[PDB]
Design a protein around this ligand. Structure first.
Ligand SMILES: CC(C)(C)CC(C)(C)c1ccc(O)cc1
Ligand SMILES: CC(C)(C)CC(C)(C)c1ccc(O)cc1
Lengths: 241, 9, 236, 10
């Protein structure tokens, strides 16, 4: 594996280089939107983002070392957490608003409809990122940690266990990379450990938001007002709500 | 399975 | 205004947490290995209800917790209660591979989870967490730190400074214990990360468990205490 | 009114 051979700096470079683009919504400020069609823009965007996410995952060090089956599982478990952390990242410099797309910046108001609590959680996370002054280098590390960690405990044989061993080694490498970055920021050893803890505890909140979002998506399917793509429906189904 | 295919190619 | 928690030393913190530990409770002494969904879930919810009372008194003894307003204490416990029960269960079960030690006289395996529809998935996640902890050689001093982190962290971003300062102190305490155990610098930060990442899985299990408890409530077969119902209701 | 309120104070 070339992944376990990367220096901290090379890891950061690889991750930054692999960042997906920020996509546009079909939002039109002159057109009227219902709670439903508003949700329609967001599900349309998520579907397009998912395609880029899949191709992004292929560039995360270590990911392609895994079996197709294991890759499928990790992405099925992590996809919404990954969309959410990306959204919170984009929104960090827009206090009280979520930048779903450059042409779609919303406050909690428009977020009509369940979705209200989720919007509030996302804003709180963005606020937290802002308090901590989260750096782009730290962000890409966190996103990759989510991809690798979220599905790791929900995977047959003792050989299928080696797959998980490799994931833990890559995760350790990303931890080393985070500490390396903080050491460069001039943080004391005590400050490094504290910040590392602070960053990882946010992942618990992101998991929570994803779980809540997954249940909201399931109710949207049931109501059949908001259009959901085949990919989104398959990703939902994978959670077996 | 869409995800499976997109990952493969 | 200033909290005594922040003035404690690492050793003092560890001792305080170890001392606050709730007792391990027993289930009913009937020899009948629960096979029905009713008897099974009946035993577990009865146990959970009794554990909750001890948890509430345990929380009051976590440094920094009583310095919060009653409303904040209520919020944190409402958000964290199931995560806290689950990490406790996983800890108790660590030395019993393949088994969940709900009580000394109630040690179950995944086969028995099948009794209750929707329970085997949750049992499997708990077993995986137990195994992970066992293979990491989780120590009791580390466990109490993680459990207190859950209490203070899980609800913090749905309200701060005080709680985050206390969280930092617990982090300091965790590193203190790892250095005390002879870990190198690289091993310390790697182990810190490994442990905190498991908290993400514990959150996930809690979320799934809450959904299962909700469905149990709607089926209306198992009797649920008013306390358990209010804790469940808080999650809307 | 919540039982938790009462238990946290008792
Ligand atoms: C769950 C869904 C992706 C449908 C909506 C939402 C608001 C959580 C979302 C949409 C796009 C995105 O990039 C992040 C989150
Ligand atoms: C959610 C409930 C407490 C009903 C069940 C379960 C298996 C998660 C549980 C029960 C007791 C306990 O100490 C930990 C978890």
């Amino acid at each position: 594996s070339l992944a376990l051979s990367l220096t901290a700096d090379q890891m950061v470079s690889a991750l930054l280089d692999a960042e997906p683009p920020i996509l546009y919504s079909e939002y039109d400020p002159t057109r009227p939107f219902s709670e439903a069609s508003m949700m329609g823009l967001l599900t349309n965007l998520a579907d397009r983002e998912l395609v880029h996410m899949i191709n992004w995952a292929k560039r995360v060090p270590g990911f392609v070392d895994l079996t197709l089956h294991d890759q499928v599982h990790l992405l099925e478990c992590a996809w919404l957490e990954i969309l959410m952390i990306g959204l919170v990242w984009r929104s960090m410099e827009h206090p009280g608003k979520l930048l779903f797309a450059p042409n779609l910046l919303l406050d909690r108001n428009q977020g009509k409809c369940g979705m209200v609590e989720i919007f509030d959680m996302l804003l709180a996370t963005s606020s937290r990122f802002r308090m901590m002054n989260l750096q782009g280098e730290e962000f890409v590390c966190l996103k990759s940690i989510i991809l690798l960690n979220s599905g790791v405990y929900t995977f047959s044989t003792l050989k299928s266990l080696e797959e998980k061993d490799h994931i833990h080694r890559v995760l350790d490498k990303i931890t080393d990379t985070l500490i390396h970055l903080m050491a460069k920021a001039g943080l004391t050893l005590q400050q490094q450990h504290q910040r590392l803890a602070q960053l990882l505890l946010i992942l618990s909140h992101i998991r929570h938001m994803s779980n809540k979002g997954m249940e909201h998506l399931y109710s949207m399917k049931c109501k059949n007002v908001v259009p959901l793509s085949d990919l989104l429906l398959e990703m939902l189904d994978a959670h077996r709500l | 399975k869409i995800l499976h295919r997109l990952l493969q190619e």
